[PDB]
């Protein structure tokens, strides 16, 4: 995700605030700001489209098998949303490397709450507050 400044495109700094960073192994190639979930023992992969797959956001671009830094819950992050969002909206991994609202998803509870609204395809600021896994 990107700022534009004249000719230049700058990558956004993903992590706004938060001290709880943790290291994992990439199960596949991943890019900065993607939501990820556990896919093997300490191995993280990109989150699919509804609930039950979120541990945190990947902080930097990786090849498969490289070490990954996550921002987990308790972090504030700059993340791209696939739809227009507003303050107080709960958001969820979208399956597309973006987030979307809980309201749009098939799920009933989110993983982060929007603090600063954004248009479709634009960077919101959100607080990550929960993880989601396999409940059946």
């Amino acid at each position: 995700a990107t700022e534009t400044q004249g000719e230049h495109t700058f990558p956004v700094e993903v992590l706004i605030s938060g001290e709880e960073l943790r290291g994992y192994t990439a199960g596949e190639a991943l890019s900065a700001g993607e939501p990820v979930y556990l896919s093997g023992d300490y191995e993280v992969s990109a989150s699919s489209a509804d609930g039950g797959e979120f541990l945190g956001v990947n902080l930097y671009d990786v090849a498969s098998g490289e070490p990954v830094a996550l921002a987990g819950d308790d972090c504030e992050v700059r993340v791209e949303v696939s739809e227009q969002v507003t303050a107080n909206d709960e958001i969820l991994p979208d399956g597309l490397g973006t987030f979307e609202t809980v309201a749009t998803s098939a799920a009933s509870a989110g993983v982060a709450i929007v603090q600063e609204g954004a248009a479709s395809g634009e960077v919101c600021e959100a607080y990550i507050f929960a993880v989601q896994g396999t409940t059946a």
Binding site: E13, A32, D61, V62, A63
Partner: protein, 82 residues
């Protein structure tokens, strides 16, 4: 917070420069996937480097199978008319 691998920080890293310089000097084609690790292409953003093999010295060096004149190992961009 910004890590050493984080996308907004890559241009500050001495290794990002050193390794992109290596990649240009080592390359034999613009087809990165033929030659470089998925790690290298991601970590050093090699899609954004102007890699084509034109900076590799061995693109310009003669290596004929029989050499009676000691011509092999000469680099054509070091000749008088280059």
């Amino acid at each position: 917070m910004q890590l050493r691998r984080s996308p907004g920080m890559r241009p500050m890293d001495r290794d990002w420069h050193q390794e992109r310089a290596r990649a240009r000097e080592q390359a034999y084609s613009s087809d990165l996937t033929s030659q470089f690790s998925e790690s290298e292409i991601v970590k050093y953003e090699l899609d954004t480097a102007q890699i084509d093999g034109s900076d590799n010295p061995r693109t310009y060096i003669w290596n004929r199978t029989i050499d009676l004149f000691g011509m092999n190992g000469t680099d054509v961009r070091e000749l008088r008319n280059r």
